[PDB]
Amino acid sequence: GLPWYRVHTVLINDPGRLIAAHLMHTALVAGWAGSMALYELATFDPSDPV
Amino acid sequence: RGWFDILDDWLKRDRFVFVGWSGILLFPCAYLALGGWLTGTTFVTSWYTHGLASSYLEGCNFLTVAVSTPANSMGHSLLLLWGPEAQGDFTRWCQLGGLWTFIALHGAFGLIGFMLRQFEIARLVGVRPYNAIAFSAPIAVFVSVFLIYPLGQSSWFFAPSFGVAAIFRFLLFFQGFHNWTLNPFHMMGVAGVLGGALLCAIHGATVENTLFQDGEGASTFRAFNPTQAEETYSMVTANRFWSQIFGIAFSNKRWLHFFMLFVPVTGLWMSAIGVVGLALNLRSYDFISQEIRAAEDPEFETFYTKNLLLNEGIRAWMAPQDQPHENFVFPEEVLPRGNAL
């Protein structure tokens, strides 16, 4: 069947599910940003900017 | 039938040396990179940038001549002939290191030219472009070592100089300063290059020793016809031999030849990444846990601590002369030395 390194080629002629994948990627990236900010806020010391 | 298509015809004619569209980038740059190096190695000093003789004219042999890098004061200047530093004086340009950037930049564009040639010839002839793809490994090594690396540092001064022994000094600089041998991206590169040579030798040997008898002569080279359909060696006997010798063997001639592409290309790419880190002095210099133990415990000694003493010797003993723009003056008494030596 498809090798492991080609599984996402099933989207090349499926604009619908291509958009679905691009949405999920975009979801994960924005998810990351939000999680990264919250982690930095929980650990940041704001009391000496010098 | 316009001029473009007429010119296409003429570039792509079947001649002793194929030209192509890619030849317009390739051939001038290839030839100027080559010309610059031979010119500089024959006639051009490194006195003003390095304090070094480096041409045949000055007394150097093939192993010590180099087109050396520009002085550290040039920063990352392009050092164009017509630029603010040389101001068009060809002679000064040579004494300031202008042939280094000239050679590096034309070489870079020549390497692009060559990879486009691989693409151009591949398309015309109807084969897949895997030889082009493979050539990305050399390009990564070249750009990462000759361009990215010195761009992360203070100046072009610390790139490699184009010369046999100058490259040897680059090797030792990286040991003493970056502890480059401790870097796993270099280690993967080593495995890829030595794995490549292994695969080269073992595949060549296997084929030549599983040959079919296809003519009667003691020299078996004559019994290959380049248009025969039949394989010229027995995959079945080779596979049995290695299966019983080594435990595993290849059974797929396509995977085998793909693997031979994959191993060295990957190793070079991996070493290139390590070098990108060293542009920033982001080394794998140390193991923190060993240093904490060793600082507290003077009886703890590894091959790891022994090699760092070596690095410390390298830096202190080579830096004044290798980095003359710094005016390091190290009295005899500050130099690190073991007993007696």
Partner: protein, 82 residues
């Protein structure tokens, strides 16, 4: 299996080839020789002659230390020898 250029083995066994190239080849070898024996190669390229790496009582490299005054520095150094 040829592209129409004349074979090399055919050219370099030919009397005409060697009639032209027994003049050209030594002429070039002699020219490059004179490039060096005349001293011209020193002056074109900027390479120090054996006696002009240092001034007489000087043991300091004349190292370019400036980017935009570099040209002038080299010239200052060359004065220190004449």
């Amino acid at each position: 299996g040829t592209t129409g250029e004349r074979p090399f083995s055919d050219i370099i066994t030919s009397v005409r080839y060697w009639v032209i190239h027994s003049i050209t080849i030594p002429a070039l070898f002699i020219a490059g020789w004179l490039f060096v024996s005349t001293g011209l190669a020193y002056d074109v390229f900027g390479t120090p002659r054996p006696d002009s790496y240092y001034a007489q009582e000087q043991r300091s490299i004349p190292l370019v230390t400036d980017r935009f005054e570099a040209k002038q520095q080299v010239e200052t150094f060359l004065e220190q020898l004449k």
